[PDB]
Ligand binder design. Structure first.
Ligand SMILES: CC[C@H]1C(=O)C[C@H](O)[C@@H](C)[C@@H](/C(C)=C/[C@@H]2CC[C@@H](O)[C@H](OC)C2)OC(=O)[C@@H]2CCCCN2C(=O)C(=O)[C@]2(O)O[C@H]([C@@H](OC)C[C@@H](C)C[C@@]3(C)O[C@H]13)[C@@H](OC)C[C@H]2C
Length: 107
């Protein structure tokens, strides 16, 4: 599944709801912490709408448990990420992933 570990607290009150657009900054790492992507590197917050099947399962479930302003480390098992397929050249088959995510706002 997904483990959610707080890096910095949010407001503890305002959580994503289906149909809202989550605006986040993230860094994606392989299991050992090696970075493969970051929205921070491109100076571009990432937006996705909850309930629209736009993201891997670990994000859909993990980000929903974050409150606005929170930073969290999401450790996502392969079944909740890219599974057996992986994503050739970026994500190995059967990879556990770690994302640092900051929930900036809901739009
Ligand atoms: C069409 C191009 C469109 C896109 O990729 C949309 C797509 O849905 C994205 C949002 C989705 C993802 C790749 C789903 C798969 C669909 C196939 C299905 O089999 C898979 O199931 C297991 C899941 O991403 C995710 O769920 C997760 C969680 C949210 C953050 C991104 N995610 C990551 O894992 C990353 O960090 C990663 O580096 O992000 C980059 C990134 O581009 C720099 C994507 C956007 C920022 C840019 C966008 C919108 O422009 C693309 C990505 O590039 C191709 C490779 C991955 C490894």
């Amino acid at each position: 599944g997904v483990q959610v570990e707080t890096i910095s607290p949010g407001d503890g009150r305002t959580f994503p709801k289906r149909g809202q657009t989550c605006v986040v900054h993230y860094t994606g790492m392989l299991e050992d912490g090696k970075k493969f992507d970051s929205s921070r590197d491109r100076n571009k917050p990432f937006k996705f709408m909850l309930g629209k099947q736009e993201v891997i399962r670990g994000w859909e479930e993990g980000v929903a448990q974050m409150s606005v302003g929170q930073r969290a480390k999401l450790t996502i098992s392969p079944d909740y990420a890219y599974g057996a397929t992986g994503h050739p050249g970026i994500i190995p088959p059967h990879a556990t992933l770690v994302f640092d995510v900051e929930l900036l706002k809901l739009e």
